[PDB]
Amino acid sequence: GVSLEQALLILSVAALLGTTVEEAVKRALWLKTKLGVSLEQAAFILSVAAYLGTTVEEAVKRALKLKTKLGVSLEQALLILFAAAALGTTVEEAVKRALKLKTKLGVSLEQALLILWTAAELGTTVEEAVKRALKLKTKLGVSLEQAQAILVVAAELGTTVEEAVYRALKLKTKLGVSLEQALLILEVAAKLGTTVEEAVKRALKLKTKLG
């Protein structure tokens, strides 16, 4: 039950790490096996360690200690570490900022941590990122989460958000994928230095390899 999403996430992590898909597969599967987590979560851990600038062992150690410290899930600890690595701050500072933003926007801590990460990814203030994202939310009728993903995809593509949404909706129409999946395909192709068709072709080959 290896999904196209899972294959696309692997391709993305191969690009982030600057290694082959074969190497990223192996590295992700070793870590999934070692920790008994999902493939998606193993890919997320590889991404967090890249962002932290630590080894994977070290990132896992930090995440497990932070789970116990705050009583949160592994996923939440990883998101806190990620938001802190993107901010260049301590986890305590990251969570402090998330809590202030949580109260301001009336969103969850997890949503606030994602916003902080996204603003850092865009090189903008949070206020700017939230303004842009909320414009999209209202204009397109997408979630705040979806709007943030659109901002990030557009940046990877080197285009406006209008361009990114135009392409994503074409992929939805043509291939019957969700907007989320269309955005992921777009992002992966940009990260790999390929066309959308070639990214999807690769993903399918990889999905099968792991069948």
Numbering used by the authors: 23 to 233
Task: Copy text from the publication.
Here we address these limitations by introducing an artificial metathase—an artificial metalloenzyme designed for ring-closing metathesis—for whole-cell biocatalysis. Our approach integrates a tailored metal cofactor into a hyper-stable, de novo-designed protein. By combining computational design with genetic optimization, a binding affinity (KD ≤ 0.2 μM) between the protein scaffold and cofactor is achieved through supramolecular anchoring. From the catalyst perspective, we sought to address this challenge by designing a derivative of the Hoveyda–Grubbs catalyst (hereafter Ru1) that contains a polar motif, aimed at interacting via H-bonds with the protein, as well as improving the cofactor solubility in aqueous media.
To further improve the affinity and ensure near quantitative binding at low micromolar concentrations of dnTRP_18, we set out to increase the hydrophobicity around the Ru1 binding site. For this purpose, positions F43 and F116 were individually mutated to tryptophan. Both dnTRP_18_F43W and dnTRP_18_F116W (hereafter dnTRP_R0) displayed a nearly tenfold higher affinity with KD = 0.26 ± 0.05 and 0.16 ± 0.04 μM at pH 4.2, respectively. A comparison of apo and Ru1·dnTRP_R0-ΔHis X-ray structures with computational models reveals an overall agreement with the toroidal shape but notable deviations with regards to the shape of the inner cavity, as well as the position the Ru1 cofactor. The Cα root mean square deviation values between the AF2 predicted models and the X-ray structures range from 1.59 to 1.63 Å.
